């Protein structure tokens, strides 16, 4: 069990967590301004994204705040407390994502025009706001700018394969 | 100054702070699910709000996270480190607010319906995302559910008057 004290400690860490609502998420601190993520459960399970532009700060020793906005218009504020194996995340979903989540279940990078046309056309308000604590079930050192971490759609057994060490090689690349 | 350790230490605290971008803001933890705010600087300078429903948690000892969504559509995620006199805020502004913050420059409570029509009528995207650290320049024990704290429109010398003890009497009521 490693102690996180600095931003450098945090960057390059790969996480799997589960919100109190039972929603399982995956997330990767690729470099100081970039994140990859993959959704395994809940309303938007199936969604995954690479090269997401984000603000990443250390609030105070070992506590990290990540802020971004998505192609669908979803806003995300995550607070990592890895020394306590926990997170707090607030997700602000546009109305249309709650109504039609199926649209957004894709590799969003390959469907940006669809997301943006959908977010303009459909309802934004009222937002669905999900502020929840989470338990971290996996933490691995991927190194930074590792393009293999999140590079395929989720499948049901994936998080288990990751946690059992059946997914990545000695280079932290896909088996 | 005082150590903040629990949610009760935090609730009822009245704050003034200045973000790294120079925007001065005022904020009040009215109760465990409600905030009051008043804006002194930057984009929406002059806006003030009472009775904004918010999610308030303590992340870990003395660190507090406040999440809410506004009548204009703005999404907010605030992090308080009152023991270090530091804040980090991320404000996700709808595009039309950055376009015409003046509509929004008002006592929002008397203008909910205007804000709702405005947010549907005008452009949401792209969002202006403002993630910034802030120095806390004032903290006062207001007590919970004190409606005097934020009960008038900002004026130029107000944060100075508050800091220099010329705004409240000993009961934390307006002078
Ligand atoms: Ba590292």
Give the residue numbers of B annotated as catalytic, written as ranges: 25, 70
Partner A, chain B 133-152, Cβ-Cβ below 8 Å: 133
Which residue out of A17, A19, A24, A25 is catalytically annotated? A25
Rounded CA-CA distance B127/B135 in Å is 25
Task: Write out the residue range of the structural domain in which residue B160 sits.
Answer: 1-175
Rounded to whole angstroms, how far apart are CA atoms A17 and A15?
A: 7
Give the distance from residue B165's alpha carbon to the nearest chain A alpha carbon, in angstroms.
30
Whether a cis peptide bond, with omega within 30° of 0, leads into A117 is no
Asked if A173 reaches chain B (Cβ–Cβ under 8 Å), the answer is: no
Are A27 and A15 in contact, with CB atoms under 8 Å apart? yes
Q: What CATH number corresponds to the domain at position B7?
A: 2.40.128.20
Q: How far is CA B140 from CA B15, B136, B154, in A?
A: 7, 11, 18
Q: What angle do CA B20, A92, A121 make, to 5 degrees?
A: 110
Give the C-alpha distances (Å, rounded to integers) separating B85 from A136, B113, B135: 29, 36, 6
What 3-state class would DSSP assign to B173? coil
Bond into A126 cis (ω within 30): yes
Sheet containing B24-31: give its strands across: B48-53, B34-39, B24-31, B13-19, B128-141, B86-93, B75-81, B63-69, B55-60
HEC sequence for A99-136: HCHHHHCCEHHHCHHHHHHHHHHCCCCCCEEEEEEEEE
Q: Do B120 and A125 touch (CB under 8 A)?
A: yes
Q: For tokens 């003890």, what's the residue? A: B165
How many Cβ pairs within 8 Å bridge chains A and B? 81
Region at A62 (left for phi over 0; alpha for psi -120 to 50; beta for the rest): left
Place of tokens 């002078």: B175
CB A171 within 8 A of CB A141: no
Task: Report the relative pairing of strands B24-31 and A34-39 from DSSP bridges.
Answer: unpaired
Secondary structure class of B152 (helix, strand, coil): coil
Number of domains in chain B: 1
Is there a contact between A146 and A23 (Cβ–Cβ < 8 Å)? no
Residues of chain B neighbouring A73 (CB-CB closer than 8 A) = 124-125, 127
- Euclidean distance between CA atoms B167 and B1, whole angstroms: 20
Both tokens assigned to B1: 């100054």
- Residue B75 DSSP class: E
Whether the Cβ atoms of residue A14 and residue A139 lie closer than 8 Å to each other:
yes
CA distance B34 to B79: 15
Residues 6+ apart with CB under 8 A from B97: B43, B44, B72, B73, B74, B104, B128
Tell me how the structure was determined.
X-ray
| CA triple B134-B140-B144, angle to 5 deg | 110
């Amino acid at each position: 069990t490693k102690t996180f004290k600095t931003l450098d400690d945090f960057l390059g860490t790969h996480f799997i967590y589960t919100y109190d609502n039972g929603w399982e998420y995956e997330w990767y601190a690729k470099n100081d301004h970039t994140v990859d993520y993959r959704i395994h459960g809940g309303m938007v399970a199936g969604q995954w994204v690479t090269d997401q532009k984000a603000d990443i700060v250390m609030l105070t020793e070992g506590i990290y705040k990540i802020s971004w906005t998505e192609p669908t218009g979803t806003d995300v504020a995550l607070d990592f407390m890895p020394n306590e194996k926990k997170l707090h995340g607030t997700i602000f979903f546009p109305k249309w994502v709650e109504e039609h989540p199926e649209i957004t279940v894709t590799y969003q990078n390959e469907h940006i025009d669809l997301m943006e046309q959908s977010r303009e056309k459909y309802a934004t308000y009222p937002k669905l706001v999900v502020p929840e604590f989470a338990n971290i079930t996996y933490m691995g050192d991927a190194g930074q700018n590792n393009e293999d971490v999140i590079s395929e759609a989720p499948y049901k057994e994936m998080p288990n394969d990751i946690r059992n060490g059946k997914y990545f090689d000695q280079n932290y690349h896909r088996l």
